[PDB]
Symmetry: C3
Subunit: 191 residues, 3 copies
């Protein structure tokens, strides 16, 4: 035992977890924990759930490495319950690994990462995903990880954890989430 290495998905945690953040509201002084989010690129864009940021007076985002920014709402999308936020990117933002060539398959191991410290759960893709139906997994998806990332054993993004037929959780496929993000960055709320 002392010699061998335990079976683990910590590799995927190290690669992906730095990019998953905590999202807060700062009403006026009161601070509330809204949910989780995912940093997508170096420009400083972040995906979360529309319900997380629906009634936010001031939106704060907190990385695992200690940094704390204020975020502005780029726009949202009610059908997929997504929302894009924006923050100034100090040189060096951790971003969620994305592989556009990677095709998710049923049975793929996935970790749901969310920051209520950080909390990670394991399952598989039960079913591959408005425009299209969503990705299903038996990894626990709750408020503490709603808006966070779902990743495979390599750390590659498979989807965005979402809330709301029992024992199964839902994520929005990363292909669709990317397209919704882009369209929200250009136009605003899009229909």
């Amino acid at each position: 035992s002392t010699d061998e290495t335990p079976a683990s998905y910590n590799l995927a945690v190290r690669r992906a977890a730095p990019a998953v953040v905590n999202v807060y509201n700062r009403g006026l002084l009161e601070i509330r924990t809204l949910g989780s989010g995912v940093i997508m690129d170096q420009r400083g864009y972040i995906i979360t759930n529309k319900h997380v940021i629906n009634d936010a007076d001031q939106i704060i985002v907190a990385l695992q490495d200690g940094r704390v920014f204020e975020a502005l709402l780029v726009g949202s999308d009610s059908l997929t319950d997504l929302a894009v936020l924006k923050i100034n990117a100090t040189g060096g933002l951790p971003t969620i690994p994305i592989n556009a060539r990677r095709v998710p398959h049923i049975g793929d191991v996935v970790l749901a990462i969310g920051n209520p410290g950080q909390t990670i759960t394991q399952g598989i893709i039960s079913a591959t995903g408005g425009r299209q139906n969503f990705l299903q997994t038996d990894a626990s998806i709750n408020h503490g990880n709603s808006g966070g990332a779902l990743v495979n054993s390599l750390g590659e993004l498979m989807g965005i954890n979402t809330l709301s037929p029992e024992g199964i959780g839902f994520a929005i496929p990363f292909q669709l989430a990317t397209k919704i993000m882009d369209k929200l960055i250009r136009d605003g709320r899009v229909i």
Copy 2:
């Protein structure tokens, strides 16, 4: 990441999932989803749960590949809550992989496959299984997969998912299910 392959049990899904079917009732016009089932052999026999087919006016079975047959009830077994159905086998029926030599061990990875699209969940054998006590697993077993198959990482049948001490699901060991099926094929309902 782009180079490497994600950890996955999709191999077992491809081998086993084609054999798991949807079972319906066709009362007179109304169609209801009863549950799931498993095709056992080329003769066209199918195992499901006695409770799934208990009050069926007309029984319909639907494969993943698009084919739709009517099934007749060969007989049932109340103690194990199993039921054997029969359909005409067009040349080429997908059958559930079975390995009679394979000995299931505690800790074995298992997938619960059921067709409510198809839905798959992952766990292990918590406990190895009337005549004998049943197999236990922490893979989610619900109505959407009740009557479906439980399989290992190789796709080999370990048992038949059944419903009805929390957080644990139950399947009937494939050895016992085979024997009950045979006895139901020969005699009818057996005691």
Copy 3:
């Protein structure tokens, strides 16, 4: 399929499960199942939950191999809900594998072993752990395994399953559990 070997954590079950025991009460004749426990060393010391043994007239411990001892309460610790018991050690007691050099990492596969036959569930370490916060896992932790062991793929002890924010279970890190045990062996109940 017939050739290949199923993915399994049965290795860790064989190494660790023999050490996890059933704990009973023997009030005066009535016998009740209190919960689970873990044999730590050859001296015959056993860890369980303070709540399992809180109102015990007579404490009985039963190994998987058939042996049945009476245990005496060495002392307890309310903050961590732990308790140390003692039994006479016939030559040959199975003990829970412990690796003091092993550092638990987030994402590590873990099995929760408890004896309500024996029942085992699988998850990962969601979060690494009074003195310190506890270890989190998505492996099912219930009464049937409360007081039992949490182990990695190698069978090495990671913590003691404990009961009492949804979908997540808690174990006391094995490093802290060792220290509490020692201090309870020397002084008694410790503060």
